[PDB]
Protein backbone atom coordinates (compact mmCIF):
# COMPACT_ATOMS: atom_id res chain seq x y z
CA UNK A 1 0.00 0.00 0.00
CA UNK A 2 0.96 3.66 -0.29
CA UNK A 3 0.58 4.50 3.41
CA UNK A 4 -1.82 6.94 4.98
CA UNK A 5 1.18 9.05 6.02
CA UNK A 6 3.17 9.34 2.77
CA UNK A 7 1.21 11.89 0.69
CA UNK A 8 2.31 14.94 2.74
Amino acid sequence: AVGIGAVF
Partner: antibody
Amino acid sequence: QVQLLQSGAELVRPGASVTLSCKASGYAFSDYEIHWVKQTPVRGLDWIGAFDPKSGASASNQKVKGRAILTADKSSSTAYMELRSLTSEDSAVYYCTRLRYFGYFDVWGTGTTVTVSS
Amino acid sequence: DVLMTQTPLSLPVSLGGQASISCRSSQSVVYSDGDTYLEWYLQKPGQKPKLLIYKVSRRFSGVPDRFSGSGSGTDFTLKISRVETEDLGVYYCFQGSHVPYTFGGGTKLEIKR
Protein backbone atom coordinates in the same frame (compact mmCIF):
# COMPACT_ATOMS: atom_id res chain seq x y z
CA GLN B 1 14.11 -10.51 14.41
CA VAL B 2 11.17 -8.28 13.50
CA GLN B 3 8.04 -9.29 15.42
CA LEU B 4 4.71 -7.74 16.44
CA LEU B 5 3.23 -8.87 19.76
CA GLN B 6 -0.45 -8.59 20.66
CA SER B 7 -2.60 -9.71 23.56
CA GLY B 8 -3.97 -13.22 23.15
CA ALA B 9 -7.67 -12.49 23.65
CA GLU B 10 -10.08 -9.92 25.07
CA LEU B 11 -13.65 -10.54 26.22
CA VAL B 12 -15.65 -7.30 26.10
CA ARG B 13 -19.13 -6.53 27.34
CA PRO B 14 -21.49 -5.09 24.70
CA GLY B 15 -21.35 -1.30 24.60
CA ALA B 16 -17.90 -1.13 26.22
CA SER B 17 -14.50 -0.27 24.77
CA VAL B 18 -11.39 -2.32 24.10
CA THR B 19 -7.81 -1.11 23.62
CA LEU B 20 -5.68 -3.41 21.48
CA SER B 21 -1.91 -3.37 21.84
CA CYS B 22 0.52 -4.00 18.98
CA LYS B 23 4.13 -3.80 20.03
CA ALA B 24 7.03 -3.99 17.61
CA SER B 25 10.60 -5.24 18.03
CA GLY B 26 13.61 -5.51 15.76
CA TYR B 27 13.33 -2.26 13.81
CA ALA B 28 13.04 1.52 14.02
CA PHE B 29 9.45 2.04 15.15
CA SER B 30 8.78 5.39 13.46
CA ASP B 31 9.88 4.24 9.99
CA TYR B 32 6.82 1.97 9.61
CA GLU B 33 3.13 2.69 9.98
CA ILE B 34 0.96 0.26 11.96
CA HIS B 35 -2.22 -0.94 10.26
CA TRP B 36 -5.07 -2.90 11.86
CA VAL B 37 -6.98 -5.58 9.95
CA LYS B 38 -10.14 -7.35 11.14
CA GLN B 39 -10.52 -11.04 10.24
CA THR B 40 -13.98 -12.57 10.37
CA PRO B 41 -14.67 -16.18 11.38
CA VAL B 42 -14.59 -18.16 8.13
CA ARG B 43 -13.16 -15.49 5.76
CA GLY B 44 -12.90 -11.83 5.21
CA LEU B 45 -10.07 -9.48 5.88
CA ASP B 46 -11.27 -5.96 6.57
CA TRP B 47 -8.89 -3.04 6.86
CA ILE B 48 -9.85 -1.14 10.02
CA GLY B 49 -7.30 1.66 10.20
CA ALA B 50 -3.71 2.79 10.49
CA PHE B 51 -1.36 5.09 12.40
CA ASP B 52 1.86 6.65 11.12
CA PRO B 53 4.36 7.32 13.96
CA LYS B 54 6.45 9.58 11.71
CA SER B 55 3.69 12.08 10.85
CA GLY B 56 1.10 11.33 13.55
CA ALA B 57 -1.69 10.71 11.01
CA SER B 58 -4.75 8.51 11.52
CA ALA B 59 -7.31 6.85 9.24
CA SER B 60 -10.09 4.28 9.47
CA ASN B 61 -12.54 2.54 7.17
CA GLN B 62 -16.06 3.78 7.45
CA LYS B 63 -18.05 0.78 8.69
CA VAL B 64 -16.71 1.60 12.18
CA LYS B 65 -16.41 5.13 12.78
CA GLY B 66 -17.10 7.42 15.70
CA ARG B 67 -15.47 4.49 17.48
CA ALA B 68 -11.88 3.80 16.30
CA ILE B 69 -9.07 5.79 17.95
CA LEU B 70 -5.59 4.98 16.66
CA THR B 71 -2.57 6.11 18.66
CA ALA B 72 1.00 5.03 19.25
CA ASP B 73 3.56 5.28 22.02
CA LYS B 74 6.95 5.92 20.40
CA SER B 75 8.53 6.05 23.86
CA SER B 76 7.47 2.42 24.25
CA SER B 77 7.37 1.79 20.48
CA THR B 78 3.76 0.62 20.89
CA ALA B 79 0.67 1.17 18.77
CA TYR B 80 -2.84 1.16 20.22
CA MET B 81 -6.32 0.89 18.72
CA GLU B 82 -9.35 1.75 20.83
CA LEU B 83 -12.81 0.62 19.68
CA ARG B 84 -15.77 2.14 21.50
CA SER B 85 -19.34 0.93 22.13
CA LEU B 86 -18.79 -2.61 20.91
CA THR B 87 -21.46 -4.94 19.55
CA SER B 88 -21.30 -8.61 18.61
CA GLU B 89 -20.61 -7.31 15.09
CA ASP B 90 -17.11 -6.36 16.30
CA SER B 91 -16.18 -9.83 17.55
CA ALA B 92 -13.32 -11.08 15.38
CA VAL B 93 -9.55 -11.62 15.32
CA TYR B 94 -7.80 -8.26 15.01
CA TYR B 95 -4.33 -8.33 13.44
CA CYS B 96 -1.72 -5.59 13.48
CA THR B 97 0.84 -5.28 10.70
CA ARG B 98 3.50 -2.80 9.62
CA LEU B 99 3.86 -0.74 6.45
CA ARG B 100 6.75 1.37 5.21
CA TYR B 101 5.80 4.13 2.78
CA PHE B 102 5.00 2.55 -0.60
CA GLY B 103 5.88 -0.86 0.88
CA TYR B 104 3.69 -3.78 1.94
CA PHE B 105 2.34 -5.75 4.91
CA ASP B 106 5.36 -8.01 5.28
CA VAL B 107 5.22 -8.64 9.05
CA TRP B 108 2.01 -9.41 10.94
CA GLY B 109 1.07 -9.85 14.57
CA THR B 110 -0.28 -12.96 16.24
CA GLY B 111 -3.75 -11.43 16.43
CA THR B 112 -6.11 -10.74 19.32
CA THR B 113 -9.37 -12.69 19.49
CA VAL B 114 -12.02 -10.20 20.65
CA THR B 115 -15.40 -11.54 21.82
CA VAL B 116 -18.27 -9.12 22.50
CA SER B 117 -20.77 -10.71 24.89
CA SER B 118 -22.53 -10.24 28.20
CA ASP C 1 -15.33 2.19 -1.66
CA VAL C 2 -12.95 0.68 -4.22
CA LEU C 3 -14.53 -2.71 -4.64
CA MET C 4 -12.73 -6.05 -5.03
CA THR C 5 -14.64 -8.96 -6.59
CA GLN C 6 -12.82 -12.29 -6.20
CA THR C 7 -13.74 -15.46 -8.10
CA PRO C 8 -14.08 -18.31 -7.54
CA LEU C 9 -15.17 -18.75 -3.92
CA SER C 10 -13.44 -22.15 -3.69
CA LEU C 11 -10.99 -23.72 -6.13
CA PRO C 12 -10.45 -27.50 -6.41
CA VAL C 13 -7.11 -28.41 -8.02
CA SER C 14 -5.19 -31.68 -8.22
CA LEU C 15 -1.85 -32.02 -6.47
CA GLY C 16 0.76 -30.80 -8.92
CA GLY C 17 -1.95 -29.06 -10.96
CA GLN C 18 -2.38 -25.45 -12.05
CA ALA C 19 -4.56 -22.93 -10.21
CA SER C 20 -5.82 -19.54 -11.38
CA ILE C 21 -7.43 -16.92 -9.11
CA SER C 22 -9.21 -13.86 -10.51
CA CYS C 23 -9.72 -10.50 -8.79
CA ARG C 24 -11.49 -7.48 -10.29
CA SER C 25 -11.66 -3.92 -8.97
CA SER C 26 -14.45 -1.34 -9.10
CA GLN C 27 -12.06 1.32 -10.43
CA SER C 28 -8.47 1.61 -11.55
CA VAL C 29 -6.06 0.92 -8.70
CA VAL C 30 -3.17 2.84 -10.21
CA TYR C 31 -1.86 5.21 -7.54
CA SER C 32 -0.75 8.83 -7.82
CA ASP C 33 2.86 7.58 -7.80
CA GLY C 34 2.50 5.66 -11.11
CA ASP C 35 2.59 2.16 -9.58
CA THR C 36 -0.36 -0.17 -8.95
CA TYR C 37 -0.45 -1.28 -5.31
CA LEU C 38 -2.15 -4.64 -5.86
CA GLU C 39 -1.16 -7.34 -3.37
CA TRP C 40 -1.95 -11.02 -2.78
CA TYR C 41 -2.11 -12.56 0.69
CA LEU C 42 -2.62 -16.09 2.01
CA GLN C 43 -4.11 -17.06 5.38
CA LYS C 44 -3.70 -20.72 6.27
CA PRO C 45 -6.17 -22.27 8.74
CA GLY C 46 -5.29 -21.09 12.23
CA GLN C 47 -2.35 -18.94 11.11
CA LYS C 48 -1.79 -15.24 10.56
CA PRO C 49 -2.03 -13.69 7.08
CA LYS C 50 1.07 -13.85 4.90
CA LEU C 51 2.31 -11.78 1.96
CA LEU C 52 2.96 -13.39 -1.43
CA ILE C 53 2.67 -10.78 -4.19
CA TYR C 54 2.97 -6.97 -4.21
CA LYS C 55 3.05 -4.45 -7.06
CA VAL C 56 0.96 -6.53 -9.34
CA SER C 57 3.64 -8.95 -10.57
CA ARG C 58 6.52 -8.85 -8.04
CA ARG C 59 7.31 -11.74 -5.70
CA PHE C 60 7.97 -11.20 -2.00
CA SER C 61 11.12 -12.62 -0.43
CA GLY C 62 10.78 -16.35 0.18
CA VAL C 63 7.79 -16.92 -2.10
CA PRO C 64 8.50 -19.58 -4.76
CA ASP C 65 8.32 -18.92 -8.48
CA ARG C 66 5.25 -21.15 -8.88
CA PHE C 67 3.26 -18.12 -7.68
CA SER C 68 2.79 -15.65 -10.55
CA GLY C 69 0.80 -12.41 -10.39
CA SER C 70 -0.40 -10.39 -13.37
CA GLY C 71 -2.87 -7.59 -13.93
CA SER C 72 -3.92 -4.74 -16.18
CA GLY C 73 -6.25 -1.97 -15.02
CA THR C 74 -9.16 -3.58 -13.17
CA ASP C 75 -8.51 -7.28 -13.91
CA PHE C 76 -5.89 -9.15 -11.88
CA THR C 77 -4.72 -12.76 -11.78
CA LEU C 78 -2.73 -14.94 -9.39
CA LYS C 79 -1.42 -18.20 -10.84
CA ILE C 80 -0.09 -21.12 -8.77
CA SER C 81 1.77 -23.88 -10.63
CA ARG C 82 2.50 -27.41 -9.36
CA VAL C 83 0.17 -26.96 -6.41
CA GLU C 84 1.41 -28.36 -3.10
CA THR C 85 -0.32 -29.50 0.06
CA GLU C 86 1.31 -26.44 1.64
CA ASP C 87 -0.65 -24.18 -0.74
CA LEU C 88 -3.92 -24.73 1.14
CA GLY C 89 -5.65 -21.70 2.60
CA VAL C 90 -7.63 -18.63 1.58
CA TYR C 91 -6.07 -16.20 -0.90
CA TYR C 92 -6.94 -12.50 -0.73
CA CYS C 93 -6.29 -9.81 -3.27
CA PHE C 94 -5.67 -6.39 -1.74
CA GLN C 95 -5.68 -2.84 -3.11
CA GLY C 96 -3.58 -0.31 -1.23
CA SER C 97 -3.90 2.77 -3.44
CA HIS C 98 -7.15 4.44 -2.30
CA VAL C 99 -8.07 4.66 1.39
CA PRO C 100 -9.92 2.86 2.74
CA TYR C 101 -7.80 -0.07 1.61
CA THR C 102 -9.90 -3.10 0.75
CA PHE C 103 -9.46 -6.86 0.45
CA GLY C 104 -11.19 -9.29 -1.86
CA GLY C 105 -13.69 -11.83 -0.64
CA GLY C 106 -11.09 -14.57 -0.70
CA THR C 107 -10.64 -17.81 -2.62
CA LYS C 108 -10.44 -21.08 -0.69
CA LEU C 109 -8.01 -23.55 -2.24
CA GLU C 110 -9.33 -27.08 -1.73
CA ILE C 111 -6.95 -29.65 -3.20
CA LYS C 112 -7.97 -33.02 -4.63
CA ARG C 113 -6.10 -36.13 -3.51
